[PDB]
Design a protein around this ligand. Structure first.
Ligand SMILES: O=c1ccn([C@@H]2O[C@H](COP(=O)(O)OP(=O)(O)OP(=O)(O)O)[C@@H](O)[C@H]2O)c(=O)[nH]1
Ligand SMILES: [Mg+2]
Length: 215
């Protein structure tokens, strides 16, 4: 197994109300877990626990190896679009090209005279919300890691573009990788190996899309 939570309860503030309550799941190596639930349900907090920023007050957690995290808040640092995606990782042309293709960024980049050397975050280009989101996703996917934590990475994208990038990037390009995707969309839950729906910190549902269909 690659990631396990067993009877996990946790608090952001001692004496407070629990942000996660008796959470249980298991992800095998290479599987996809979809994490869903309304605002404040605890989805980002669950990712923070995997990254060691929140410790459990009850229960056990298993995870090993390097993590790549994509925040639900897209961000850019001053530098080229290539520098933002590589972000200090060693460069490889094939790997880089495959990521920008999977994130539909080749279309955006081809329109600039400077191509991948277009400068972001320095007052020149003003990126759209969807461009910043796809760049942030590409940055997280380019990093080599054992576990990918993709926190609602499809911000500002229309539903067809989100569907296409879910398929090209999360399902195809990342097919061999252990993935946790915070998402609410039906196709993503249907394609996931497991689904965890959180509600006010509790497990609203844990299982497969097919199991939920049969209910
Ligand atoms: O650092 C933190 C983070 C979160 N919290 C508190 O943990 C609770 C869950 O906060 P989350 O940030 O985990 O919820 P979420 O990801 O499911 O919500 P969305 O992004 O979809 O909007 C929230 O009630 C928050 O106030 C803290 O107290 N401190
Ligand atoms: Mg969140």
């Amino acid at each position: 197994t690659e990631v396990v939570m067993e009877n996990v309860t946790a608090f952001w503030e001692e004496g407070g109300t629990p942000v996660l309550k008796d959470i249980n799941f298991k992800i095998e190596r290479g599987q996809l877990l979809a994490v869903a639930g309304s605002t404040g349900a605890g989805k980002t907090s669950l990712l923070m626990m995997i990254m060691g920023e929140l410790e459990p007050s009850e229960g056990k957690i298993k995870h090993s190896g390097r993590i790549s995290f994509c925040s639900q808040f897209s961000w850019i640092m001053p530098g080229t679009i290539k520098e933002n995606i590589i972000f200090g990782v060693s460069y490889d042309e094939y790997r880089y090209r495959s990521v920008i293709k999977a994130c539909q960024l080749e279309e955006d980049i081809s329109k600039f005279a400077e191509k991948d050397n277009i400068v972001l975050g320095e007052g020149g280009i003003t990126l759209s919300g969807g461009q910043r989101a796809r760049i942030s996703l590409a940055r997280a996917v380019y990093k080599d890691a054992d576990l990918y934590l993709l926190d609602s990475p499809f911000g500002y994208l229309d539903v067809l573009t989100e569907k296409e990038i879910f398929e090209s990037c999360v399902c195809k390009l990342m097919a061999n990788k252990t993935r946790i995707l915070v998402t609410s969309k039906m196709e993503h839950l249907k394609k996931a190996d497991k689904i965890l729906i959180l509600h006010e910190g509790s497990s609203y549902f844990y299982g497969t899309f097919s199991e939920l269909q049969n209910l």
